[PDB]
Amino acid sequence: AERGYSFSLTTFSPSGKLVQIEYALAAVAGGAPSVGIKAANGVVLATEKKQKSILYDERSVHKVEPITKHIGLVYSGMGPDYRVLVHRARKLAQQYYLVYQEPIPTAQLVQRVASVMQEYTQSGGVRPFGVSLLICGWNEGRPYLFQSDPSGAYFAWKATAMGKNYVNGKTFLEKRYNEDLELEDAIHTAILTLKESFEGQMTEDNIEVGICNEAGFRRLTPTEVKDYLAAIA
Amino acid sequence: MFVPCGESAPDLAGFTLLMPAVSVGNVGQLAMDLIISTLNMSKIGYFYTDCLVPMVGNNPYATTEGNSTELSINAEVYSLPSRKLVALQLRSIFIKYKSKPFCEKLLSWVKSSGCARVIVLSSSHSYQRNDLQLRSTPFRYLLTPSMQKSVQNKIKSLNWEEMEKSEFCIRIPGGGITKTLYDESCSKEIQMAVLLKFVSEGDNIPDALGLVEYLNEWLQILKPLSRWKIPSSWRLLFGSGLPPALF
Amino acid sequence: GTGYDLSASTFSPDGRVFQVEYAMKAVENSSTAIGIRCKDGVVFGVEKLVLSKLYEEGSNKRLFNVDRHVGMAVAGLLADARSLADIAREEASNFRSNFGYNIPLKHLADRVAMYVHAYTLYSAVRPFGCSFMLGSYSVNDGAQLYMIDPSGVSYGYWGCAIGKARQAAKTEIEKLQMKEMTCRDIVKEVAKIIYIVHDEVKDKAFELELSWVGELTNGRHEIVPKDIREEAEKYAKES
Amino acid sequence: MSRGSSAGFDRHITIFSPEGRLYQVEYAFKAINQGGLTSVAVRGKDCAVIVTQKKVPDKLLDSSTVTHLFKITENIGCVMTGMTADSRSQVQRARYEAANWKYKYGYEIPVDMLCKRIADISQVYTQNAEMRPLGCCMILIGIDEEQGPQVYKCDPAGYYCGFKATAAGVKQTESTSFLEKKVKKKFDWTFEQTVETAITCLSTVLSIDFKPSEIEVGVVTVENPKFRILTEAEIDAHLVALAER
Amino acid sequence: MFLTRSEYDRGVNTFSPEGRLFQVEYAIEAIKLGSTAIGIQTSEGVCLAVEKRITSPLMEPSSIEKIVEIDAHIGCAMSGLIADAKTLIDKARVETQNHWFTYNETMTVESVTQAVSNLALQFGAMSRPFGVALLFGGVDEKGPQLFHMDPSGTFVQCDARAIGSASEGAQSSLQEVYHKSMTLKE
Amino acid sequence: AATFFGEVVKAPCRAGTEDEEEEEEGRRETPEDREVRLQLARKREVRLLRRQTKTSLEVSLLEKYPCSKFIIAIGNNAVAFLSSFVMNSGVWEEVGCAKLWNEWCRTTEAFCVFYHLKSNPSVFLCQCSCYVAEDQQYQWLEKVFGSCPRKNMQITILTCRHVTDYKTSESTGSLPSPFLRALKTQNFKDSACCPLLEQPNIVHDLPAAVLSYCQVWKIPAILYLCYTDVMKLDLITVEAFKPILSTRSLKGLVKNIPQSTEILKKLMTTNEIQSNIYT
Amino acid sequence: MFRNQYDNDVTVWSPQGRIHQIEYAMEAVKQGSATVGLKSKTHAVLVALKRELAAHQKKILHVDNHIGISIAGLTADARLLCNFMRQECLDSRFVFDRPLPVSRLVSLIGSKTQIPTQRYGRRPYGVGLLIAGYDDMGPHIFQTCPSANYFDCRAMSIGARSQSARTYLERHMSEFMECNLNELVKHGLRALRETLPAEQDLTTKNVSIGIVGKDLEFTIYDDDDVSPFLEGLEE
Amino acid sequence: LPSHPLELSEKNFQLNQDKMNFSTLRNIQGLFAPLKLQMEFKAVQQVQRLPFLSSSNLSLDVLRGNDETIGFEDILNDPSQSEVMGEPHLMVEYKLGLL
Amino acid sequence: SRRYDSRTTIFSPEGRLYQVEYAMEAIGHAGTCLGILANDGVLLAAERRNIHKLLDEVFFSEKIYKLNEDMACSVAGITSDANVLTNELRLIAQRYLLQYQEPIPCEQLVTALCDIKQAYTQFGGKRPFGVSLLYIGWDKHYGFQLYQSDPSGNYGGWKATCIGNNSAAAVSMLKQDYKEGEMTLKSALALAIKVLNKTMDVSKLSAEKVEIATLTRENGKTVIRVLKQKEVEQLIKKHEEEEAKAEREKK
């Protein structure tokens, strides 16, 4: 059972496990599917937004949000924690830009946000942010894709998936994803991955796509994702 | 060890011992008190063993003034030959390292007397519960392999859920005597059904009523449907009154 | 919620804060404290259970006045009642100092209720075990009566009660109609209800304290005159 | 917290469960249900509308005092469903946030911003051990300069997503179904149409045709962009219109 | 009708049903766990004695001294947790030093013991009751004076007191042999 | 605990089932743990002996010496009353002493010495000013009686309790504090001399052990509950035991009230000081 | 029975809506020694029954020029309360140049002792104070129950065996008003002796008397000083 | 005296900001609002990194409403990159108030 | 043993702190990381354990970090905590360099970070980091050095060490095949790759399972570098060929 260790965040299990962080990652895994693909021309951040009801207004919370002109991200898990961390990410990006007059590299921003989350993962009295950030961006003529975890550990990725059936999503990405893979069809690959990890019917209002190329990050409009869905099927 | 109130011990062959397993509060003991009061079981003897902390009062179920002056002790044995039931009543905490000795003593006692089932009324912790356990239901059960097929199928037809097993082990968080008693009964190869309810400490009278109803679903020792008479001793279950100066 | 009543910052399986409910029951642990709102103003009465004759008359009184025009009848933890009376005094004083006029009963009641709610929110402290009801009268404001609970909800009433026999006094007030007579007629009703809901067998003796505010008293809270207070007691004895 | 962290997966706000469930936030939603009432807010072409059933439990209780519709700022209006004291405290918090926004940025806060700030506060409450989520559900309304009508549900978990039509309370799901059916047949919801749709949604989910004193209608319109709580006679007229059709 | 467990002895801010702080009494008896100091006050002066316990022959008895000096006219004997007695007597020394510095006089034994008690009152600074008792035997302008400090935090006037292991027996013998008209040598 | 902010804590358990389960999980105990546990058990060991050579009797007082009655006193007030009113009646020479140790008692002013009138050797007295732990209570029982009864002795157990423990419908501070109750076994067919203890009120500790042993083994016994508000050898509390002098117990073992109460004041006034924790 | 969960912390309500820690503090004051307080038209008198070799405790204390107190509970919280009372009176006489009213001081102590009950990490002040005083409106005899709420009393007693003293004071509650200082003190001594066992009679080393009067300021009387009153005191 | 007129103005800028905020709330809302805000700030500050590391204080800024605002204190001198650092135990003791 | 492990600040009857022991167990759950001192320099043969087919290589190194001009270290434990710990290492080194304008001696930096970790162990409410770092570097005083700290702050000097997975076997076999004062960086890398081969039984050395660093002194400058994929492939091939030749000789 090892319940005393299950409840407490600041304790190590006899085997040496931080169970609270494991449960935060379980919350992440129980979130909405989110697939990110690092193409050659740019990157894709596609996910399955939970605004499928007609009442849910479109011009509202967006699953994919920008931090800078050249960086954006998507999450899987807790919306509130995601939004708070997005605010912190924007704060850090502005700090870096005012200190160096340089666009914050994606890796540096990922480091800063991951350290912020590790801060609450370390001390007792709070809980790990039950959300993982699929942060993308573009620097020095190169696409970027990173994955942050409630533990505060972060890794670089070429194509990764989150949420439900996320292991199946990663298997599908490994099946399909190619290193040479270019943009405008990596979007198709992400659409197909989310379809493989979908529940219901695929509609332009059931997904939220954001790509970042040389131009920069840009949340795709319903029309664009509708066109991509029509091209897929 | 069993010590009759009179000169001889009345045989308990073909009976079923109903057990309070001291656990999380007194849910099992309160359920046993409810059962003894409702069935109006008469004290048959004292399970005089040095494992329980000694106490002495008066008969908890006293209905007449004559019954109110009947000295009681920590462990008292009651029986109802009409239903062939035996109701041991532990009314005390256990002593360090004496729980498993008590389990061995009681299981040997029931083996010798002839009681077939040692059905235990116990409890577990309403926390340390999985999401499924939290969502599903508090009541659980556990039947040793020696359990007869007929009653096992009766319980299955009642559609009960069995205590979660964590090979696995029979774990009852906050059960104490419960787990070891079940293990030693399985070793003895004598029948027992460990009925329990996931509960948190506090006012557990409703929990005791729920547990006795859970048992009634199976044994139907009461008309299946205030129905469960409470001991006359149930009173001042939050201490004395409040002082006049305050409030 | 046996496992969810140990802290005020924890919800029950169905969304209840049992600490606040236990505070509301601690309110019931105290004797009744009635108050009826008339068109002329309000009249306050309390089933003040006498503790001992050693205590000087006026000891541990129940009918406070946090402002010149605001009364306060309480029922529950006496210390908490005094604490919230002091809080209301400070709030009214600052309101008069800054806004320039006497704090409206509504504003004062809301401020104190939100203070009580602040206390019920965090796990550092516990909810107030007391409950009270304010009353005021002004030429412009008119008759006003509010009641604050341990939860911290400030609802307005045309007459209500708090304490052991709260429900019986509430039903008697419902049986009574209050907005077509003056305070001099509702004081007798208050006394009658307090006597009716009082239990002699359970409680040997009790003292009935009466206070009111209205056009009768020129919009000020005062203790009912002994002559009128005795007459109200006499009416209560009659019925 | 002062006493520490409660014992068990679902007993303390901070600690997770095996799936990572914050059961205490779900119990805050259960408290919103405990409120006992149902509220329906409707967004439309001209008017953003908020309607709820107002209960005066006893005759002695002053009907004027009891209310579940509050005004935060001239533009902003809201209906609270859930614990009464928590609702009032969150309304005060929203007013404080709006005042702070006006001071900092010079111009009045929009609806979505007030909800987002309140949701951030709620997220902090969930994160920490000392505080607990408030058992109330805020449904803001207002006329945005760019969009116009704006109805935003605003939850203890801190989910500020806007809406074309919002419901809350004990009959939340039925109201959502009825309003989804209504919007699927969108009819250019005018002020009268919006008010009638909200009133009839409440009367259908609760299955009771209300008296004007049994409900509280609040409307903010493009013509009148300041929050306005309808009076007894006006709600009576609206109910008569509903009865006629 | 059921014997149960209730634990009021873990926490100095918890009252037992009888209204008793078990932590303070546990400190009181923890003093008795130590060695006994025989304090006596007479009109001719006050004497302080103690049974200092030398654990091994290699130990230096100078370092284990239980009787200390807080001022020229003030003295006390320690018994119990000597580590906390360090802080207690340091506070007393500081107080008497500031008195000599400011008023250029002698602090009364009652005053210095009151100050060090004010230090000792802080528990629940210390987070637990002080586990050591002192016998402030001094001769101030007022005259010979014996006092006692306890984990309770407050002092008490005394003329004949023994505290530590076999404190009861030492006190019985002291009251057998002590009389008001005795001399300091006696 | 609540040592720091987010310290996860657990509620006190009435049943103490967690401690029992820990004690029932000793199947994987280390040899050093077992050795130290047995040393603790040896520490917690009552030892009945004769002070002639401080040597264990190796037999219960009942078995060794015939017993016709054994008045037990458990508590400072009970032992004071029994040492004042009874010991002036005759000689009461010592028969043996029990040496027990626990966190709240020592081997001796924590004594459990026994006596017998020595004019009637069958009548015995016990002076248990110490406290006997739950694990040591049955050990004391088998060391003083031997688990085999005589069924022919009047076991009069005396104890002092706090009125706080006594539960009542009204406030616990609204009782005639110095009052005494009774609890008697099946065999005991004598007048209680006082009101019997209420139902929800139960007793524990050594007196409960003795009374339960007498009930199980059919020995006429009575246990007296002297409830008080002060437990510092006050005259009121030990005069609350006065009524039991009239009843059969201590009926022929009492010499004269005035002599007892005269020395009773000396016993009350010769006690020590309880530091300066209260006033 | 079921109160163990809710009887250990002072910031938790029981299912019966009670804080048992406050009741346990009120029991702690009860377990303390018995003291008596009563006032005449012109005097407020405190009489306390002290605890063998070694000096006794100071139940009677001079907290201020015209305010005095008697302690019947824990010594530590009593010392802190006395310090706070003395500081308040000193500050009043220093800044406002006003003898701090006894009732105002009692209200301050009520709030002070209310603080811990609603705060975690603290315990209620387990002490009962019989505060004597005289200013403006004649003498002032008060009683601060360790539960913050307090009472004003013409006569009072608190401690162990204090019920007998309370009963005797009730027997003559009205007489004290029309009594000379001497007679008031003797009534106090008789009330104290009610608490003593029938065998014991009041001595000089087990009695301290605190007296504040119209012209008189509060003073503590020792064995020799209390002997006058004990000389003449009817048995 | 200070090294500059702005020295104390910005040494205690935040202190004055909170002081004025609470004063205004007390004057308008009442006693409850400052109490509540103080409680939330205290609760969030109780839990963070030890003083010898750089705490994020994320949730504290979220409550304060400056989690999406930048000031000169954010950029000019960075506490995350300090030039002189004390011993860990020493600074933890200082924070606890032992020294 | 289900007691005295609720907090890091609580002792057991034996005088044990179980929380730091569980942190060391968590270290044991990490990946193999070697460090071998040599005459020419010092190396850090770590296990990449980045074997997903959709993983990027946008970073300097996963296991291996650089602290200053004179120091480098590996990590075996919790990555999230290791990141902040390495940041602290860099910051401390730069603080010392700014104050004294000389590179921090390796032992001083090791001890400072051990102070950090043992301070988190000391005070309640804080979780011990649970990261074991394998430090290497050069300084004027003790030349090339090899250090190894644990979650509890206990650090030791080493000629060859291992942390993470199969650490005990790796250390035993290192001391079975290590010469004091004779090993050159060449033979040091050979021994490191041999130990990795014989410890990492999950798969054969594919040159991406392995991440070896090197720290030498050329022109009086500490040259911290990482073996190229070609270099580690050559190491693996040399070791495998030598093992095959030895097997052939055994016959």
Curated annotation (Swiss-Prot), chain B:
SUPFAM superfamilies associated with the record: Cgl1923-like (SSF159659)
Principal subcellular localization: nucleus
UniProt PTM comment: Degraded by the proteasome upon completion of 20S proteasome maturation.
Keyword terms, alphabetized: Chaperone, Nucleus, Phosphoprotein
GO biological process: chaperone-mediated protein complex assembly; mitotic spindle assembly checkpoint signaling; negative regulation of apoptotic process; proteasome assembly
A Pfam entry, by short name: PAC2
Keyword Nucleus assigned: yes
Subcellular location: Nucleus
In-chain residues carrying the UniProt-annotated modification Phosphothreonine: T137
Entry GO MF terms: molecular adaptor activity
Signal peptide: none
Coiled-coil parts of chain: none
Tissue specificity: Widely expressed with highest levels in lung, brain and colon. Moderately expressed in muscle, stomach, spleen and heart. Weakly expressed in small intestine, pancreas and liver. Highly expressed in hepatocellular carcinomas with low levels in surrounding liver tissue.
Gene Ontology CC annotation, any one: cytosol
Related illness: Proteasome-associated autoinflammatory syndrome 4: An autosomal recessive, autoinflammatory disorder characterized by panniculitis and erythematous skin lesions apparent in early infancy. Additional features include hepatosplenomegaly, lymphadenopathy, autoimmune hemolytic anemia, fever, generalized lipodystrophy, myositis, joint contractures, and mild motor and speech delay.
Entry's family note: Belongs to the PSMG2 family.
Subunit structure: Forms a heterodimer with PSMG1. The PSMG1-PSMG2 heterodimer interacts directly with the PSMA5 and PSMA7 proteasome alpha subunits.
Full protein name: Proteasome assembly chaperone 2
Organism lineage: Eukaryota, Metazoa, Chordata, Craniata, Vertebrata
Gene designation: PSMG2
Swiss-Prot record, chain C:
Any GO BP: proteasome-mediated ubiquitin-dependent protein catabolic process
CDD domains per record: proteasome_alpha_type_3
Coiled-coil regions listed: none
Pfam family, one: Proteasome_A_N
Record localization: Cytoplasm; Nucleus
Keywords: Acetylation, Cytoplasm, Host-virus interaction, Nucleus, Phosphoprotein, Proteasome
Residue positions where Phosphoserine is found in the record: S239
GO MF entries: ubiquitin protein ligase binding
Induction entry: Down-regulated by antioxidants BO-653 and probucol. Up-regulated by bacterial lipopolysaccharides (LPS) and TNF.
Keyword flag Nucleus: yes
Residues with PTM N6-acetyllysine: K53, K202, K226
SMART domains, per the entry: Proteasome_A_N
Family matches, as PANTHER family: PROTEASOME SUBUNIT ALPHA/BETA
Family, per entry: Belongs to the peptidase T1A family.
Subunit structure of this chain's protein: The 26S proteasome consists of a 20S proteasome core and two 19S regulatory subunits. The 20S proteasome core is a barrel-shaped complex made of 28 subunits that are arranged in four stacked rings. The two outer rings are each formed by seven alpha subunits, and the two inner rings are formed by seven beta subunits. The proteolytic activity is exerted by three beta-subunits PSMB5, PSMB6 and PSMB7. Interacts with AURKB. Interacts with CDKN1A. Interacts with MDM2 and RB1. Interacts with the C-terminus of TBXA2R isoform 2. Interacts with DNAJB2. (Microbial infection) Interacts with HIV-1 Tat protein.
The protein's name: Proteasome subunit alpha type-3
Gene label: PSMA3
Curated annotation (Swiss-Prot), chain D:
GO biological process, one term: positive regulation of canonical NF-kappaB signal transduction
Subcellular location: Cytoplasm; Nucleus
Modified residues (Phosphoserine): S17, S63, S64
Oligomer and partners: The 26S proteasome consists of a 20S proteasome core and two 19S regulatory subunits. The 20S proteasome core is a barrel-shaped complex made of 28 subunits that are arranged in four stacked rings. The two outer rings are each formed by seven alpha subunits, and the two inner rings are formed by seven beta subunits. The proteolytic activity is exerted by three beta-subunits PSMB5, PSMB6 and PSMB7. Interacts with ALKBH4.
Any Gene Ontology CC annotation: myofibril
Entry keyword annotation includes Cell membrane: no
Family designation: Belongs to the peptidase T1A family.
Modified residues (N6-acetyllysine): K102, K104
Function as written in the Swiss-Prot or TrEMBL entry: Component of the 20S core proteasome complex involved in the proteolytic degradation of most intracellular proteins. This complex plays numerous essential roles within the cell by associating with different regulatory particles. Associated with two 19S regulatory particles, forms the 26S proteasome and thus participates in the ATP-dependent degradation of ubiquitinated proteins.
Top-level taxon of the source organism: Eukaryota
Protein name in the entry: Proteasome subunit alpha type-6
GO molecular function: endopeptidase activity; NF-kappaB binding; purine ribonucleoside triphosphate binding; RNA binding
Repeat recorded as keyword: no
Chain positions found as Phosphotyrosine: Y159
PROSITE patterns, sorted: PROTEASOME_ALPHA_1 (PS00388), PROTEASOME_ALPHA_2 (PS51475)
Pfam families xref list: Proteasome, Proteasome_A_N
Swiss-Prot record, chain H:
Superkingdom as given in the UniProt entry: Eukaryota
Disease cited in the entry: Keratosis linearis with ichthyosis congenita and sclerosing keratoderma: A keratinizing disorder characterized by ichthyosis, palmoplantar keratoderma with constricting bands around fingers, flexural deformities of fingers and keratotic papules in a linear distribution on the flexural side of large joints. Histological examination of the skin of affected individuals shows hypertrophy and hyperplasia of the spinous, granular and horny epidermal layer. Proteasome-associated autoinflammatory syndrome 2: An autosomal dominant autoinflammatory disorder characterized by onset in early infancy and severe inflammatory neutrophilic dermatitis, autoimmunity, and variable immunodeficiency.
GO biological process, one term: proteasome assembly
Sequence motif High-affinity association with the preproteasome, residues: 26-30
Family in the record: Belongs to the POMP/UMP1 family.
Protein name according to UniProt: Proteasome maturation protein
The entry's keywords: Chaperone, Cytoplasm, Endoplasmic reticulum, Ichthyosis, Isopeptide bond, Membrane, Microsome, Nucleus, Palmoplantar keratoderma, Ubl conjugation
Included stretch of the parent chain: 43 to 141 of 141
Entry's localization field: Cytoplasm, Cytosol; Nucleus; Microsome membrane
Record has Endoplasmic reticulum as a keyword: yes
Disulfide-linked positions: none
Tissues expressing this chain: Strongly expressed from the basal layer to the granular layer of healthy epidermis, whereas in KLICK patients there is a gradual decrease of expression toward the granular layer.
Upregulation: By IFNG/IFN-gamma.
Keyword Chaperone among record annotations: yes
Predominant subcellular localization, coarse grouping: cytoplasm
Source organism of the structure: Homo sapiens (Human)
